[PDB]
Amino acid sequence: LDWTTFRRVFLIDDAWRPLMEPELANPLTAHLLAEYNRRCQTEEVLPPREDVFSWTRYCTPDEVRVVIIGQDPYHHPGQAHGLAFSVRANVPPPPSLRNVLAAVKNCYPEARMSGHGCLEKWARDGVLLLNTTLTVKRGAAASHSRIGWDRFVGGVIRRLAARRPGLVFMLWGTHAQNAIRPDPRVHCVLKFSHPSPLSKVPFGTCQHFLVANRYLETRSISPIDWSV
Ligand SMILES: O=c1cc[nH]c(=O)[nH]1
Fold first, then answer.
1. Catalytic positions?
2. In this structure, which residue's CA is closest to atom 5 in ligand 1?
3. What's 140's domain CATH number?
4. Number of domain units in the chain
5. Rounded CA separation 125/224 (Å)
6. C-alpha of residue 70 to centroid of ligand 1, in Å
7. Spatial contact of 148 and 28, defined as CB atoms under 8 Å apart
8. Omega prior to 47 cis, within 30 of 0
9. Which of 54, 69, 76, 85 to mutate to test the pocket of ligand 1 (most atoms within 8 A of CB)?
10. CA–CA distance, 169 with 149 (Å, rounded to integer)
């Protein structure tokens, strides 16, 4: 009972079994899991274990329309909850997220913006918010970036993409563009500089949300209501 036990520890939705189960058997995965559990014995690891795989709960692989890649979770208590960039409902949006929400409103002036930074609505809509590193030590950015999450997540993404042609990938920044390299003839690959205001080009000028919806329409795929 490997999948059964793994799924129970992380409360993973069963719909993701075909994409994740094959990764469990890889010997490299065992090293990853043991290291993650070792870190939890020696430090404050975020987000909480029950939230690490929260991204599997909002939508099934077949509902995925857009994939947005991130680096690692927010590292202060209360911010991260398993979705890249999203913060729980009453936490003020951090700098990069603030720029993302700005670009959405610039693209869709009619979008019903709530003012919060919780992206669960997007997730249920098939917008997969995926960090390549799923955990972080409290207060230390990129601290868990070399423990092996990237190859596991990388394996799930390859499987998903091969399962469903015509996905839209939004790759913002140097890390995202080097981590994930989907076939641009089979999928819509959109690249931009990082959303942080420290980037040389203001992220508020990014048109990705509009361009993604035009691509979906050409494939007869229902476009996304980016209001959040
Ligand atoms: O989840 C998060 C938060 C900030 N930056 C990222 O790359 N991912």
1. 72 (proton acceptor)
2. 85
3. 3.40.470.10
4. 1
5. 7
6. 5
7. yes
8. yes
9. 85
10. 20
